[PDB]
Amino acid sequence: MELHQIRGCHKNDIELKKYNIGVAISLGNKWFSIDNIEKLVKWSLLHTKEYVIIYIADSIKLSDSHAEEVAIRYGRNLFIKIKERVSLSFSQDEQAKIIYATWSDIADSKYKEKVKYLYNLYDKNINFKNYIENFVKEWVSKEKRTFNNNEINKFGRYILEQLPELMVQVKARGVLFEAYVYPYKTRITEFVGLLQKGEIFPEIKTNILDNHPKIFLEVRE
């Protein structure tokens, strides 16, 4: 595993250890085996400024929040497996650098205001709604299963919940992390790139972005 492509800084800022690094796990994505998560976490500990923040970032009713629901159904059991692998793979010195951020650790009141902005935009702006939905339709068109329009719309809202964490630097239990690692560029990361630059839906940048954009580090074998 090494850095492939970087959006938001130069290669020199990474080998200089300027930033804390988040490991965004897409639970249910076949690449995020425990072995690959361990390799992302290993790489992150070696390149980080200080901390590695592990969190659930995607999931393509016991809670009003899909990301919360995911957290309590599956995110906890995943965190339990990662913890045990880590305590056998790393020294007590390294384990102290790891923060297991739950959805509620990240989605504080400031975060929820951003999400709420997006939800309202999804409901009142039909171009924005239509665009978010097509991300969903693209994904589902590479899966076998079909989905109705009502579920497409629901899946779109799930994206908006995670959007601020990809766009802005947020704190996880009082620890700012400026960059996150992910094994592949996606349509989401290209979308976020445009949002941060105000080249698409510029109202979003005006209302939720703070001139400290999340840095995306593409890291894989």
Residue numbers in the entry: 1 to 60, 70 to 230
Verbatim from the authors:
Cyclodipeptide synthases (CDPSs) use aminoacylated tRNA (aa-tRNA) substrates to form peptide bonds between two amino acids yielding a cyclic dipeptide product (CDP). ParaCDPS from Parabacteroides sp. 20_3 (GenBank: EFK64745.1) produces cyclo(His-Phe)8 whilst ParcuCDPS from Parcubacteria bacterium RAAC4_OD1_1 (GenBank: ETB63777.1) can synthesise both cyclo(His-Glu) and cyclo(His-Pro)9. ParcuCDPS belongs to the XYP sub-group of the CDPS family, characterised by the presence of 3 residues: X40 where X is a non-conserved residue, Y202, and P203 (numbering respective to AlbC). ParcuCDPS displays a Rossman-fold common throughout the CDPS family.
The active site includes the four conserved residues previously identified: S26, Y167, E171 and Y191. Previous research by us and others has shown that mutations in active site residues seriously reduce product formation in CDPS enzymes. The active site mutants – S26A; S26C; D58A; D58N; Y167A; Y167F; E171A; and E171Q—were also generated to confirm the loss of activity upon removing catalytic residues. Further investigation into the changes imposed by these mutants was performed by solving the crystal structures of a select few mutants containing changes to the active site or the pocket residues. The mutant structures were able to be solved using WT as a model and retained an equivalent fold to ParcuCDPS (Supplementary Notes 4 and 7 relating to Supplementary Figs. 13 and 14). Therefore, the disruption of activity is caused exclusively by the change in these few residues which appear important for the enzyme to produce a CDP.
